[PDB]
Design an enzyme around this catalytic site. Sequence first.
Site, PDB file in Angstrom:
ATOM      1  N   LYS A 121       0.801  -1.227   0.000  1.00 39.11           N
ATOM      2  CA  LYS A 121       0.000   0.000   0.000  1.00 39.11           C
ATOM      3  C   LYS A 121       0.836   1.281   0.000  1.00 39.11           C
ATOM      4  CE  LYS A 121      -3.918  -2.259   2.263  1.00 39.11           C
ATOM      5  NZ  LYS A 121      -4.771  -2.334   3.489  1.00 39.11           N
ATOM      6  N   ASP A 162      -9.596   2.255   2.708  1.00 34.77           N
ATOM      7  CA  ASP A 162      -9.429   1.691   4.049  1.00 34.77           C
ATOM      8  C   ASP A 162      -9.888   2.666   5.136  1.00 34.77           C
ATOM      9  OD1 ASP A 162      -8.316  -0.884   3.495  1.00 34.77           O
ATOM     10  OD2 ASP A 162      -6.284  -0.064   3.472  1.00 34.77           O
TER      11      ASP A 162
HETATM   12  O1  LIG Z   1      -7.877  -8.926   1.566  1.00 32.23           O
HETATM   13  C1  LIG Z   1      -8.125  -8.073   0.682  1.00 32.23           C
HETATM   14  O2  LIG Z   1      -8.550  -8.411  -0.432  1.00 32.23           O
HETATM   15  C2  LIG Z   1      -7.920  -6.647   0.939  1.00 32.23           C
HETATM   16  C3  LIG Z   1      -7.630  -6.266   2.196  1.00 32.23           C
HETATM   17  C4  LIG Z   1      -7.315  -4.841   2.591  1.00 32.23           C
HETATM   18  O3  LIG Z   1      -5.892  -4.757   2.769  1.00 32.23           O
HETATM   19  C5  LIG Z   1      -7.830  -3.864   1.527  1.00 32.23           C
HETATM   20  O4  LIG Z   1      -7.276  -2.562   1.748  1.00 32.23           O
HETATM   21  C6  LIG Z   1      -7.479  -4.294   0.117  1.00 32.23           C
HETATM   22  O5  LIG Z   1      -8.009  -3.331  -0.808  1.00 32.23           O
HETATM   23  C7  LIG Z   1      -8.077  -5.652  -0.205  1.00 32.23           C
END
Ligand SMILES: O=C(O)C1=C[C@@H](O)[C@@H](O)[C@H](O)C1
Length: 260
Positions: free
Chosen positions: A69, A105
């Site tokens: 991220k 988020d």
């Molecule tokens: O497990 C997932 O698919 C995600 C988890 C988070 O980190 C979210 O921020 C991400 O966009 C998708």
Amino acid sequence: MKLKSFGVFGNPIKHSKSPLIHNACFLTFQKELRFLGHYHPILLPLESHIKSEFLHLGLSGANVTLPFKERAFQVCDKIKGIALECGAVNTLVLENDELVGYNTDALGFYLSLKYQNALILGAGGSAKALACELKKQGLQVSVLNRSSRGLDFFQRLGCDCFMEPPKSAFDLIINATSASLHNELPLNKEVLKGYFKEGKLAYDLAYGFLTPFLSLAKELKTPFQDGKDMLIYQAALSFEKFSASQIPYSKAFEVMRSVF
Ligand SMILES: O=C(O)C1=C[C@@H](O)[C@@H](O)[C@H](O)C1
């Protein structure tokens, strides 16, 4: 039908439930959208770079999860929305040939929460977005890690930063540990027990299993919450962006929650 490709970049990625929930939305909203989207999990090597793959795969949009991220914030062409203050991007959209980064988020976390202060464990992208959101809400925020990593970002937000667990009561105790699955306790067991007994909610961003962090809260009868609701809200918000803001997050949320 016109087709569009989407995915989630992460390492690891096998446990992600984003494809399941996004595909359910694309399948139903193809009538309103006039295109059929498909979303796949993408395992990225730790050093390969996101932008090259996004473009090579011909994606229209993507999510970014651990441990990418912060890198996504750096490599996208334009940052929009609250992401500007999160130092992290979890949503990428190709807009007029620019790779645009967003962060869902922050609001996904907010919406997941049914509090005056918070202790965040972690220093990565998730922790950063949560610190941004909680400070915005007017809570006092303490951040606890093992190193000075991310100190500048958290201090500029106005957070109190620690390496030794602070001797204070916290309403929210949040496990946002970076580049980790959360299979282990993030702090000493007695330290966690102390926080949970004086706390109001133990919150863990991991989903799909009961983490030992949450189990300790459960055993102590401290209210607890895993990352399922946050996952679904952030996903619904991302879907809104993938639809060019034609499908509101409220509608995606209903479909996603049901399939999960
Ligand atoms: O497990 C997932 O698919 C995600 C988890 C988070 O980190 C979210 O921020 C991400 O966009 C998708």
